[PDB]
Design an enzyme around this catalytic site. Structure first.
Site, PDB file in Angstrom:
ATOM      1  N   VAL A 193      10.511 -21.837 -49.041  1.00  0.00           N
ATOM      2  CA  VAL A 193       9.823 -21.848 -47.640  1.00  0.00           C
ATOM      3  C   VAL A 193       8.179 -21.909 -47.994  1.00  0.00           C
ATOM      4  O   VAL A 193       7.501 -22.498 -47.322  1.00  0.00           O
ATOM      5  CB  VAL A 193      10.552 -20.822 -46.623  1.00  0.00           C
ATOM      6  CG1 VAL A 193      11.847 -21.327 -46.403  1.00  0.00           C
ATOM      7  CG2 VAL A 193      10.410 -19.636 -47.227  1.00  0.00           C
ATOM      8  N   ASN A 194       7.896 -20.890 -48.796  1.00  0.00           N
ATOM      9  CA  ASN A 194       6.310 -20.967 -48.800  1.00  0.00           C
ATOM     10  C   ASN A 194       5.741 -22.368 -49.519  1.00  0.00           C
ATOM     11  O   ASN A 194       4.868 -22.655 -49.037  1.00  0.00           O
ATOM     12  CB  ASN A 194       5.936 -19.945 -49.946  1.00  0.00           C
ATOM     13  CG  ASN A 194       6.095 -18.348 -49.309  1.00  0.00           C
ATOM     14  OD1 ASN A 194       5.569 -18.363 -48.117  1.00  0.00           O
ATOM     15  ND2 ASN A 194       6.429 -17.529 -49.909  1.00  0.00           N
TER      16      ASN A 194
ATOM     17  N   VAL B  40      -1.360 -23.240 -58.852  1.00  0.00           N
ATOM     18  CA  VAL B  40      -2.438 -22.657 -58.761  1.00  0.00           C
ATOM     19  C   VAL B  40      -2.028 -20.941 -59.218  1.00  0.00           C
ATOM     20  O   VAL B  40      -1.243 -20.266 -58.897  1.00  0.00           O
ATOM     21  CB  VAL B  40      -3.047 -22.367 -57.572  1.00  0.00           C
ATOM     22  CG1 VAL B  40      -4.321 -21.695 -57.333  1.00  0.00           C
ATOM     23  CG2 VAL B  40      -3.525 -24.066 -56.939  1.00  0.00           C
TER      24      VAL B  40
ATOM     25  N   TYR C 118       3.215 -27.837 -48.330  1.00  0.00           N
ATOM     26  CA  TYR C 118       3.388 -29.212 -47.943  1.00  0.00           C
ATOM     27  C   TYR C 118       3.131 -29.729 -46.604  1.00  0.00           C
ATOM     28  O   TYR C 118       2.766 -30.820 -46.512  1.00  0.00           O
ATOM     29  CB  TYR C 118       4.700 -29.780 -48.578  1.00  0.00           C
ATOM     30  CG  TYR C 118       5.067 -29.220 -50.128  1.00  0.00           C
ATOM     31  CD1 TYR C 118       4.040 -29.515 -50.853  1.00  0.00           C
ATOM     32  CD2 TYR C 118       6.114 -28.905 -50.722  1.00  0.00           C
ATOM     33  CE1 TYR C 118       3.966 -29.114 -52.368  1.00  0.00           C
ATOM     34  CE2 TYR C 118       6.253 -28.595 -51.957  1.00  0.00           C
ATOM     35  CZ  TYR C 118       5.253 -28.554 -52.757  1.00  0.00           C
ATOM     36  OH  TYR C 118       5.696 -28.472 -54.360  1.00  0.00           O
TER      37      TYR C 118
ATOM     38  N   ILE D 263       2.832 -28.791 -59.532  1.00  0.00           N
ATOM     39  CA  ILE D 263       1.512 -28.139 -59.065  1.00  0.00           C
ATOM     40  C   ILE D 263       1.544 -26.756 -59.053  1.00  0.00           C
ATOM     41  O   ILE D 263       2.678 -26.115 -58.654  1.00  0.00           O
ATOM     42  CB  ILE D 263       1.257 -28.989 -57.751  1.00  0.00           C
ATOM     43  CG1 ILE D 263      -0.148 -28.645 -56.852  1.00  0.00           C
ATOM     44  CG2 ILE D 263       2.572 -28.467 -56.523  1.00  0.00           C
ATOM     45  CD1 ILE D 263      -0.447 -29.469 -55.934  1.00  0.00           C
TER      46      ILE D 263
END
EC number: 2.3.1.48
Lengths: 194, 196
Positions: free
Chosen positions: B173-174, B135, B179, B133
């Site tokens: 962590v981002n 963007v 999630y 995934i």
């Protein structure tokens, strides 16, 4: 003392009762019977909608005291192994795992897998969801044969890795996987959206 | 103004899929592991019907509404998802010419999700596994990743499938924060194993 022959073949719709019973034995072994809601109808109508190796695929391992005959996919032919003489097998459940009661062929285990995808390589691989050998047949190499059969199929098809997951506390399974040459990755965590 | 649409990828989208995966590898600082090719994507991603195996949803954006239908839709039973976004300043997209199905219109590919069916044997029930995934950077923190992830989940509901799963690096962590904001559970006990 008895001889023993094994064969790995693709499952077909008629094998659904055996697959269902094997998954149920797996749930009992994992102590998760309360999560077992699989049905024969569900297995039949989810596992065989696609051709072998296109999506969900099952290899079955069968055993016999006699050789198998010489002869579901153009991409696969059964594997055979001959085992050394040893004490006869004690299998209280043989009647639930016999395609023909009169024939000495018994389903001893399975592996369920499907194609996954290495995007950085633009290459499919296989992911193994389940592997299970029934108790009377363990410690004879069958689990190793089942796992390596998936890897051999991957090589044959030009696919990449074979992957699966293990519980980090499952040091026994980790041992079984380490002896296969598998790498255990520490850095990934499974994420889930219910 | 800004309109968005999530649709299925077709073979003509391979250049965009290839460049999105490349951006992922650049982002993760892993370009040395990127060997994907357009020919390899074209010969492996489209051997089955949508949702039967590997499936890609593409997110596209435009300053104008999208057509009501796509004539080239790879599945007669899938219709794209649409969303209208609040008027806002123009988004600077230096890479737009690499992500434009046609210079004729302003439609740009902003993200994707690559997934395929997985299986819960104890439930005899397929689910979906998300392999990628992503963007593109100009379009982040506008809800587009949330749309892509929930589109896979919405598709799972439509098909009577089970959960959606993926993996994350323990130190990413981002992505974990994204999630978790999405309602995902990060499982601690499982570890990936591999044979090559």
């Amino acid at each position: 003392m008895a001889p023993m022959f094994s064969r790995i073949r693709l499952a077909t719709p008629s094998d659904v009762p055996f697959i269902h019973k094997l998954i149920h034995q797996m749930a009992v072994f994992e102590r998760l019977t309360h999560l077992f809601s699989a049905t024969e109808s569900g297995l039949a109508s989810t596992l065989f909608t696609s051709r072998p190796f296109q999506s969900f695929t099952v290899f079955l391992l069968e055993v016999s005291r006699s050789p198998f005959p010489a002869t579901p996919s153009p991409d696969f032919t059964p594997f055979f192994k001959t085992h050394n003489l040893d004490l006869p097998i004690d299998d209280p459940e043989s009647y639930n795992f016999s395609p023909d009661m009169l024939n000495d062929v018994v389903v001893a285990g399975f592996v369920l897998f499907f194609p996954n995808y290495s995007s950085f390589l633009s290459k499919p691989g296989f992911y193994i969801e389940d592997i299970f050998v029934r108790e009377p047949y363990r410690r004879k190499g069958f689990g190793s044969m089942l796992l390596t059969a998936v890897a051999k199929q991957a090589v044959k098809m030009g696919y990449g890795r074979v992957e699966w997951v293990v519980l980090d506390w499952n040091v026994n399974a980790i041992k079984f996987y380490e002896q296969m040459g598998a790498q255990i990755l520490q850095e990934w965590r499974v994420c889930r959206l219910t």
